[PDB]
Amino acid sequence: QLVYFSSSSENTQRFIERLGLPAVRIPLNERERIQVDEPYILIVPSYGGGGTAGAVPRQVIRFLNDEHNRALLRGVIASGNRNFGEAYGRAGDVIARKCGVPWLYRFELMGTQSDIENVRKGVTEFWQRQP
Amino acid sequence: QLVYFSSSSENTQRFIERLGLPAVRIPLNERERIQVDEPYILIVPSYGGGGTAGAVPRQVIRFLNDEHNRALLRGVIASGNRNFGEAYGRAGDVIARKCGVPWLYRFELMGTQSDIENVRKGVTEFWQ
Amino acid sequence: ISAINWNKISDDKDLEVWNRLTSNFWLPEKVPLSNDIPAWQTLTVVEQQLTMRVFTGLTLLDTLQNVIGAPSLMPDALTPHEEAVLSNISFMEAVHARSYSSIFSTLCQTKDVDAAYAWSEENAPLQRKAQIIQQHYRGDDPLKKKIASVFLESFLFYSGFWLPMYFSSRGKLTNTADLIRLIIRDEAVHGYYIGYKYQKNMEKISLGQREELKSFAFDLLLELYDNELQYTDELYAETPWADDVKAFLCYNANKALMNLGYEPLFPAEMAEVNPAILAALS
Amino acid sequence: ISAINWNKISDDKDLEVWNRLTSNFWLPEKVPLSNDIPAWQTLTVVEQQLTMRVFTGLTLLDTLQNVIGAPSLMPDALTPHEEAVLSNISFMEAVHARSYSSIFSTLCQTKDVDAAYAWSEENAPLQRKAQIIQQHYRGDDPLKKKIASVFLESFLFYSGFWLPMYFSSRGKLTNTADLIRLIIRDEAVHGYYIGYKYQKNMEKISLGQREELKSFAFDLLLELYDNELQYTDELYAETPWADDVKAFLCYNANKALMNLGYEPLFPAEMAEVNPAILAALS
Numbered sequence: 156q157l158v159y160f161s162s163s164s165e166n167t168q169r170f171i172e173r174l175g176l177p178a179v180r181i182p183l184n185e186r187e188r189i190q191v192d193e194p195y196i197l198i199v200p201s202y203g204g205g206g207t208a209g210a211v212p213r214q215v216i217r218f219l220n221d222e223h224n225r226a227l228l229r230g231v232i233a234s235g236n237r238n239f240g241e242a243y244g245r246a247g248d249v250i251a252r253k254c255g256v257p258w259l260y261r262f263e264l265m266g267t268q269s270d271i272e273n274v275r276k277g278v279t280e281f282w283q284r285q286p
Numbered sequence: 287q288l289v290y291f292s293s294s295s296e297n298t299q300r301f302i303e304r305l306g307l308p309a310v311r312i313p314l315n316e317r318e319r320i321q322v323d324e325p326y327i328l329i330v331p332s333y334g335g336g337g338t339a340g341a342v343p344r345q346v347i348r349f350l351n352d353e354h355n356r357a358l359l360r361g362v363i364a365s366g367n368r369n370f371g372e373a374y375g376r377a378g379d380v381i382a383r384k385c386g387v388p389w390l391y392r393f394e395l396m397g398t399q400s401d402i403e404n405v406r407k408g409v410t411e412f413w414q
Numbered sequence: 415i416s417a418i419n420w421n422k423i424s425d426d427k428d429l430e431v432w433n434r435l436t437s438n439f440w441l442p443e444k445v446p447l448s449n450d451i452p453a454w455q456t457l458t459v460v461e462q463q464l465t466m467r468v469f470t471g472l473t474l475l476d477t478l479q480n481v482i483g484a485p486s487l488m489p490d491a492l493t494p495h496e497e498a499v500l501s502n503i504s505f506m507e508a509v510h511a512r513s514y515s516s517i518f519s520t521l522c523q524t525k526d527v528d529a530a531y532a533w534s535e536e537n538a539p540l541q542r543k544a545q546i547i548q549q550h551y552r553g554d555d556p557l558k559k560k561i562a563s564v565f566l567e568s569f570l571f572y573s574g575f576w577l578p579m580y581f582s583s584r585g586k587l588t589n590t591a592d593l594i595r596l597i598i599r600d601e602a603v604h605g606y607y608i609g610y611k612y613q614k615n616m617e618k619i620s621l622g623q624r625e626e627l628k629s630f631a632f633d634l635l636l637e638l639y640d641n642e643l644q645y646t647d648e649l650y651a652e653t654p655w656a657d658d659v660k661a662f663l664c665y666n667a668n669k670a671l672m673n674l675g676y677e678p679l680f681p682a683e684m685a686e687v688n689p690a691i692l693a694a695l696s
Numbered sequence: 697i698s699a700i701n702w703n704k705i706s707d708d709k710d711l712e713v714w715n716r717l718t719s720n721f722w723l724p725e726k727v728p729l730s731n732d733i734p735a736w737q738t739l740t741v742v743e744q745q746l747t748m749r750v751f752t753g754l755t756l757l758d759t760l761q762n763v764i765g766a767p768s769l770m771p772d773a774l775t776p777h778e779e780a781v782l783s784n785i786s787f788m789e790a791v792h793a794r795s796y797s798s799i800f801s802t803l804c805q806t807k808d809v810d811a812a813y814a815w816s817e818e819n820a821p822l823q824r825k826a827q828i829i830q831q832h833y834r835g836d837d838p839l840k841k842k843i844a845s846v847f848l849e850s851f852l853f854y855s856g857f858w859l860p861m862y863f864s865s866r867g868k869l870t871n872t873a874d875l876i877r878l879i880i881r882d883e884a885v886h887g888y889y890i891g892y893k894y895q896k897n898m899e900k901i902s903l904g905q906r907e908e909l910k911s912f913a914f915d916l917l918l919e920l921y922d923n924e925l926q927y928t929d930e931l932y933a934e935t936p937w938a939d940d941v942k943a944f945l946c947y948n949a950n951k952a953l954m955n956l957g958y959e960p961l962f963p964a965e966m967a968e969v970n971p972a973i974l975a976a977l978s
C-alpha cells in the first residue's frame with residue numbers, strides 16, 4: 156500500500172494517478188486526520204519554506220506523530236525540484252532520519268515516465284523483500 | 287567664508303542660494319578640484335550609502351585631503367533627513383571626528399526659514 | 415525592448431537610489447514584534463482602537479501605492495534604470511502594506527481589527543484622500559502623478575506615523591516603532607527620488623507651464639491638507655493629541671514641498687513639533 | 697482599491713510563495729563575483745566569448761520579464777495577494793537582469809561585452825524568441841501570457857543556464873555559478889506559481905477552451921524548441937557542447953510542462969543530462 160500527501164497544487168496527486176497503484180491521501184484539511192491499517196511507503200512533497208518554514212508539510216507531521224501510523228511506515232519517497240539544490244527532496248531525508256526508514260526515491264514535480272517506471276519496479280521489489 | 291557640496295539634486299545649493307552668504311561650491315564633476323585661501327565652515331549632505339557606503343561624498347573627501355584646504359576648515363554643518371534616524375546628518379559627524387573640528391548644525395533638505403535664520407546667526411557669532 | 419546595461423548609467427542618481435533601496439531591504443518578520451505584547455496590554459481600549467484605525471488606513475494607502483501609484487510612474491520613466499528602481503519601489507509598497515497585517519497578527523484581536531477595517535471603509539476623509547490621489551494616478555499628466563505620490567507618502571502618511579513615534583517617546587511599543595522607522599526610511603528615499611525625477615521632468619517644460627504646475631502643487635497640497643485635518647480630528651477624537659499631530663503634518667508637508675524643489679509653506683509656529691517626536695525619528 | 701489583509705488569505709499558495717520568494721531575497725553584491733577573476737583568465741577566448749553571448753542573451757530576456765512579462769500578468773490576478781506576489785516577481789526580474797551587468801563589470805572587458813550585446817542584437821533565433829514571447833504578452837488572452845512566461849524561464853533560459861553549471865562541474869567560475877543558482881531558485885518558484893495560477897484560471901473555462909489551450913501550448917512549445925535548437929547551435933558552435941545543452945533543454949522543457957499541469961513530452965533518451973550538470977544543480 157501507499158500513503159501520500161499532495162497540496163492544493165496536486166503535483167504529487169498527478170504522480171499517484173499515473174503510477175496506477177492503490178493509495179490513500181493524507182487529507183489536505185489540517186483538521187482531518189486519517190488512520191492506516193497496513194505497512195506502507197510514504198510519498199511526500201518538500202515544502203521548506205513558505206507556510207511552515209519546515210521541509211515536511213504539517214499534515215504529514217500530524218499523520219506521522221500518531222505512533223499507530225508511524226509504526227506502519229516502511230519507507231519514504233520525496234518529491235520536489237532539483238533547482239532547490241541541497242534542499243531537493245529534503246522532506247524524504249528528514250522523515251527517513253527521524254523515523255528510521257529508508258529514503259527510497261526522489262523525483263521532480265509530477266514525475267517523468269522514467270520516475271513512474273522506476274517507482275513501479277522499485278515498490279514491487281520492495282514488498283518482495285518485506286515480511 | 288563658506289564651502290559646500292551639493293549633488294545633482296541641488297538641495298544644499300538651494301539652501302546656499304536662500305542663505306545669501308558668499309560661498310564656494312565643491313565641483314560636482316569629480317575630476318575638477320578647488321582650493322580656498324581663507325578660513326571657512328563646510329556644509330555637506332549625507333549619502334550613506336548608494337554604492338559607496340561612506341556618508342561623505344567623494345568630492346568632499348578629495349577637497350579635504352588637500353592639506354591647504356583641510357588646515358583652513360573650522361567647522362561643519364550637515365544636511366540630510368531626520369527619517370534616516372541615527373544616520374541623520376552622519377556626514378557632519380564623520381568629518382567632525384576625522385578633522386577635529388566642531389559639528390555646528392544639522393538641517394533637512396533645502397532648509398527651512400528657521401534653518402536659514404539659525405545658520406545666519408550661528409555663523410556671525412562663531413567668527414567672533 | 416533592449417537589454418538593460420547597468421554599466422552604462424545615464425543618471426548617477428538611478429544607481430545611487432537603486433543601491434540605497436535594495437541594500438535597505440527588510441521584512442516585518444525581521445522585527446521582534448512579539449516583544450510588544452506586554453506593552454500592548456497596558457494601552458487603554460481607546461489607544462488600542464486608535465492604533466488599529468491608524469494602521470488599517472495606512473494599509474489602504476500602501477496598497478494604492480503598490481497597485482496603482484508606483485506602476486503609474488513607469489511609462490514616464492526617463493531611463494531604463496529608473497524603470498527598474500520603480501519596480502523595487504512598487505514591491506516595497508507591498509512590504510509596507512503586509513507589515514501592518516504583521517502588527518495585527520501579533521498584537522491584536524481579529525474582531526477588533528475587522529471593525530477597524532470597517533471603520534476605515536466608512537471614514538469619509540480617508541476615502542476622499544484615496545480618491546483624489548488615484549484620480550491623478552489615472553490622469554494623463556505625468557508630472558501631477560509625481561506630485562500626488564510625494565504628497566501621499568512624504569506628507570499625508572505622517573498623521574498615521576505620528577502615533578508609533580509618540581508611543582516610542584513614552585517607551586511603549588518600541589518594536590512596532592522600529593518597524594515603522596524602516597517604512598519611514600524607505601519613504602524618505604521614495605519621496606526624494608520621485609521629487610528629483612519631478613524636477614528633471616520639469617526642465618523639459620516651458621517656464622509658463624512650470625508656474626502653472628507650481629500653483630497646482632500648492633492647490634493640491636492645501637486641498638489634501640484640509641482633508642487631513644478632518645481625518646486627524648476623527649482619528650484622534652478621544653485623545654488630546656490632535657494639535658500635535660497637525661503640527662507634525664505641517665512639518666512633513668514642508669519636507670514634501672522641499673522634495674519637489676519648493677520652499678516650505680508652513681511657518682515655524684505651525685510646524686513646531688514636540689521635541690520627543692523628533693527624537694523618536696532620530 | 698481595497699485594503700489588503702494578509703490575515704484573510706483566499707489561497708494559501710499566495711502566502712507560501714510570498715514567503716518563499718521574499719525570504720529568498722538576494723542581490724549580486726552578496727556574491728563574491730570578483731573571486732572568479734583567476735578562473736576567467738584561464739578560459740579560452742572561445743569560452744569567454746560564449747559566456748558573454750550567453751549572458752547578454754539572458755539580460756535581454758530578463759529585461760523583457762521585468763518591463764513587460766510580469767506586469768502583463770497583474771490585471772489577471774485572482775487575489776490581491778497574488779498582485780503583491782507579482783510585484784515581488786517583477787522586482788526580482790530587475791535583480792536578475794542587473795546581476796548580468798555585475799558579472800560583466802567584475803570579469804570582462806567593456807569592448808568584448810559591447811560586442812556580445814551587438815551579437816545578441818543581430819542574432820535571429822534570439823530576436824525571434826523575444827518577438828514570439830512579447831507577442832503573447834501584448835495579446836488579449838491572459839492564459840497564453842502565463843504559458844509564454846513559464847516556457848521562457850522554466851525552459852528556454854536553460855540553454856544559457858547550462859554554461860555556468862558546466863563551468864561549476866569543472867571548478868571554474870564557481871561564484872558566478874552560485875549567483876546563477878540564486879536566479880534558478882527564483883525561476884523554479886516563478887514557474888511553479890505562474891503555472892499553478894494558469895491551472896486555477898482554467899478551472900473557470902469550458903472543456904473546449906482547455907483543449908484549445910493544450911493544443912496551443914504544445915504547438916508553442918515545439919515552435920520555441922525548434923528555434924532554441926538553432927540558437928543553441930549558433931551559441932555553442934565553437935564548442936563540442938551543443939548536444940549536452942540540448943539534453944538539458946529537454947529536461948527543463950518537461951519541468952515547464954509539468955508546472956502548467958501537462959505531462960512531460962520529451963522521452964528519457966532526449967533529456968538524459970550528464971550527471972555532473974545535474975550534480976551542479978543539487
Ligand SMILES: Cc1cc2nc3c(=O)[nH]c(=O)nc-3n(C[C@H](O)[C@H](O)[C@H](O)COP(=O)(O)O)c2cc1C
Pocket residue numbers: 160161162163164165166167168200201202203204205206210234235236237239242243244245263264265712713716888
Ligand atoms: C513554498 C515552497 C517551498 C518548496 N521547497 C522545496 C524544497 O525545499 N525542496 C524541493 O525539492 N522542493 C521544494 N518545493 C517544490 C515542491 O515540493 C514541488 O513543487 C512539489 O511537486 C509540490 O507537490 P504538491 O503539488 O503535491 O504539493 C517547494 C515548493 C513551494 C511552493
Ligand SMILES: Cc1cc2nc3c(=O)[nH]c(=O)nc-3n(C[C@H](O)[C@H](O)[C@H](O)COP(=O)(O)O)c2cc1C
Pocket residue numbers: 291292293294295296297298299331332333334335336341365366367368370373374375376394395396430431434606
Ligand atoms: C542614497 C541616499 C542616501 C542618503 N543617506 C542619508 C543619511 O545617511 N543621512 C541623512 O541625514 N541623509 C541621507 N540622505 C539624504 C540627503 O543627504 C539629503 O536629501 C540632502 O538634502 C541631499 O543634498 P544635495 O541635494 O545637495 O545632494 C541620503 C540620500 C540619498 C539619495
Ligand SMILES: [Mn+2]
Pocket residue numbers: 476479506507510567601
Ligand atoms: Mn509605502
Ligand SMILES: [Mn+2]
Pocket residue numbers: 479503507567600601604605
Ligand atoms: Mn513609497
Ligand SMILES: [Mn+2]
Pocket residue numbers: 758761788789792849883
Ligand atoms: Mn528572471
Ligand SMILES: [Mn+2]
Pocket residue numbers: 761785789849882883886887
Ligand atoms: Mn521569472
